[PDB]
Amino acid sequence: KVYVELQELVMDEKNQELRWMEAARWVQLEENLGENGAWGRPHLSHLTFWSLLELRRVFTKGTVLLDLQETSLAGVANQLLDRFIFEDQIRPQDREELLRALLLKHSHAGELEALGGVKPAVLTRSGDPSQPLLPQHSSLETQLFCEQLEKIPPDSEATLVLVGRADFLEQPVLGFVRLQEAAELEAVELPVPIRFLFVLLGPEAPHIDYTQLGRAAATLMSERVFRIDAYMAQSRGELLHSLEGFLDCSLVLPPTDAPSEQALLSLVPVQRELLRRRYQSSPAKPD
Amino acid sequence: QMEEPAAHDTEATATDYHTTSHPGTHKVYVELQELVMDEKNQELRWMEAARWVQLEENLGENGAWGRPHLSHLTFWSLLELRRVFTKGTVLLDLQETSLAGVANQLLDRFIFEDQIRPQDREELLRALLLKHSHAGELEALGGVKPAVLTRSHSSLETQLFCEQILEKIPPDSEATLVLVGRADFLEQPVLGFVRLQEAAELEAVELPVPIRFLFVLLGPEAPHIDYTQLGRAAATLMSERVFRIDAYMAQSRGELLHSLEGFLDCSLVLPPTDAPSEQALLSLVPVQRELLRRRYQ
Numbered sequence: 001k002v003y004v005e006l007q008e009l010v011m012d013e014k015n016q017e018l019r020w021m022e023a024a025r026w027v028q029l030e031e032n033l034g035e036n037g038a039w040g041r042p043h044l045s046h047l048t049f050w051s052l053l054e055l056r057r058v059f060t061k062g063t064v065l066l067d068l069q070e071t072s073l074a075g076v077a078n079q080l081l082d083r084f085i086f087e088d089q090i091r092p093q094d095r096e097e098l099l100r101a102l103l104l105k106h107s108h109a110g111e112l113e114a115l116g117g118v119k120p121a122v123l124t125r126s127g128d129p130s131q132p133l134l135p136q137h138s139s140l141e142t143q144l145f146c147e148q149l150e151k152i153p154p155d156s157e158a159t160l161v162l163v164g165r166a167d168f169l170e171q172p173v174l175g176f177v178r179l180q181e182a183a184e185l186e187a188v189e190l191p192v193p194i195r196f197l198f199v200l201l202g203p204e205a206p207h208i209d210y211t212q213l214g215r216a217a218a219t220l221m222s223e224r225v226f227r228i229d230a231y232m233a234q235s236r237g238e239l240l241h242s243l244e245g246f247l248d249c250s251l252v253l254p255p256t257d258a259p260s261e262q263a264l265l266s267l268v269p270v271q272r273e274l275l276r277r278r279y280q281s282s283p284a285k286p287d
Numbered sequence: 288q289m290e291e292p293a294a295h296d297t298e299a300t301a302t303d304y305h306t307t308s309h310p311g312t313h314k315v316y317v318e319l320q321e322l323v324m325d326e327k328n329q330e331l332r333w334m335e336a337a338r339w340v341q342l343e344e345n346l347g348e349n350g351a352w353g354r355p356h357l358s359h360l361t362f363w364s365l366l367e368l369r370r371v372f373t374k375g376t377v378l379l380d381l382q383e384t385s386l387a388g389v390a391n392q393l394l395d396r397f398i399f400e401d402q403i404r405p406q407d408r409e410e411l412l413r414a415l416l417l418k419h420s421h422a423g424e425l426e427a428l429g430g431v432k433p434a435v436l437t438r439s440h441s442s443l444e445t446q447l448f449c450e451q452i453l454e455k456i457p458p459d460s461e462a463t464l465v466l467v468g469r470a471d472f473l474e475q476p477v478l479g480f481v482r483l484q485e486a487a488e489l490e491a492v493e494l495p496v497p498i499r500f501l502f503v504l505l506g507p508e509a510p511h512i513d514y515t516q517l518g519r520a521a522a523t524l525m526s527e528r529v530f531r532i533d534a535y536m537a538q539s540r541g542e543l544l545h546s547l548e549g550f551l552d553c554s555l556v557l558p559p560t561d562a563p564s565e566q567a568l569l570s571l572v573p574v575q576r577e578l579l580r581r582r583y584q
Binding site for chain 2: 043044045046047048049050052053140143144207219220223224225246247248249250251252253254255256257259261263264265266267268269270271272273274275278286287
């Protein structure tokens with residue numbers, strides 16, 4: 001298995017300084033970081049329909065830097081922004097601010113209580129952190145699992161998911177990076193080398209919650225089939241095909257006013273068949 | 288005559304057709320019908336495929352209804368359903384008591400919105416007015432194979448629930464009919480949503496309860512477009528209480544799309560997980576409970 005960490009750009013409460021704070025982590029089973037400063041009970045990842053829809057939209061036009069010869073967040077960010085501009089995904093004027101935001105201090109649970117917590121933030125055209133304008137929604141995962149690391153194998157490689165909001169952006173942008181050699185970055189404190197980097201930047205838009213987008217990306221990375229495809233992928237098309245299979249094998253549960261265990265357990269054959277379909281194509285077999 | 292006026296999108300008079308009567312609260316029975324061909328005569332017809340009363344039942348290759356199950360939906364189903372509904376044609380409070388009149392009005396509206404060409408109207412009308420068979424006749428019809436409409440693998444639910452009504456339908460229940468067909472001559476998929484002014488017992492389609500809603504989903508073979516699953520998604524949407532209320536009180540396509548967006552907001556996606564099936568499915572119970580804690584308040 002592998003370690004996936006999701007970090008969201010947020011503003012501290014003591015000095016109003018924006019920074020990156022880990023919001024969730026995955027070792028197969030997902031943990032979330034509550035406002036208290038402790039990790040909630042780990043759980044199977046569940047995604048919202050809008051998050052997966054927007055993830056597919058951004059990935060279809062995303063930026064991929066495979067077998068990239070870099071070993072530092074600074075160089076990775078430089079190359080990623082350069083290819084973003086080359087792909088007309090961000091304008092040259094945005095590069096300075098986006099780079100400034102990316103190489104900010106990445107804080108973790110060890111400084112949440114030391115600091116004054118973290119509030120959501122939106123990067124501004126200037127060097128100041130804006131306040132989100134769209135209505136906020138307290139994370140469902142934090143409400144349901146949090147209000148109350150040895151599992152990483154020695155030879156596993158980690159993945160970093162960065163989500164941030166920037167009002168000075170035309171549309172959401174996805175940047176996917178696979179380093180040629182796994183490297184240790186200051187963003188992740190754990191002594192696990194990083195192989196993949198998800199970068200999800202963009203403005204405030206309806207039906208897009210960048211936390212849910214990051215959760216969807218992290219769940220996709222945590223999936224064995226998609227991870228194997230990503231390791232062996234030499235083009236964006238193969239990653240897109242793996243994502244299409246991942247969505248083909250997903251099960252959408254519509255809202256119901258009369259939930260029950262028996263009705264829900266009637267979907268056991270469906271879930272089994274979907275997992276079988278997902279693992280039929282990948283080299284891996286289902287555990 | 289010489290003029291062929293282009294449809295003008297105008298709503299200055301839309302409120303003049305908004306009724307002041309509060310629609311009644313009715314339980315919904317949904318029947319999904321697909322355009323098929325019978326081996327006995329090669330004659331195109333509409334055939335029962337699935338029904339919703341309390342849960343979803345599917346009709347297998349044998350004439351026997353499958354095990355009732357919760358209505359799972361594919362991601363592509365909801366994506367495409369939202370896409371078609373965004374451009375869909377809606378006839379609300381339609382004063383029609385026969386299938387022929389409903390079909391003619393819906394096709395006229397399709398032409399007005401330029402969803403179909405004038406040359407597609409006759410073939411679509413022929414398709415919509417074919418005989419509407421039911422599961423009982425499937426055995427006497429010499430079987431049934433899937434079919435496509437022209438200008439001139441088994442479904443997962445069947446595989447997982449079918450290989451092996453009046454009592455359960457409440458008294459004040461009104462039916463929703465979902466019509467799903469493939470027309471290779473259409474350029475784009477088209478969605479038709481009809482709410483009759485009053486519930487009607489359409490003779491062409493005899494259901495256990497009078498029909499109040501009609502879903503028409505037609506189009507060609509397109510990427511990620513599975514029309515049976517699209518009909519399943521529409522039926523599940525109709526079976527949901529909040530969207531059913533919104534559809535009863537909806538006066539414009541925008542309100543229906545807002546209700547659909549809320550439905551998608553309160554929808555949970557279980558990705559492919561390697562955990563035991565019982566644990567994977569039961570892990571959604573608290574999550575769904577928290578997700579729906581406000582939808583039904």
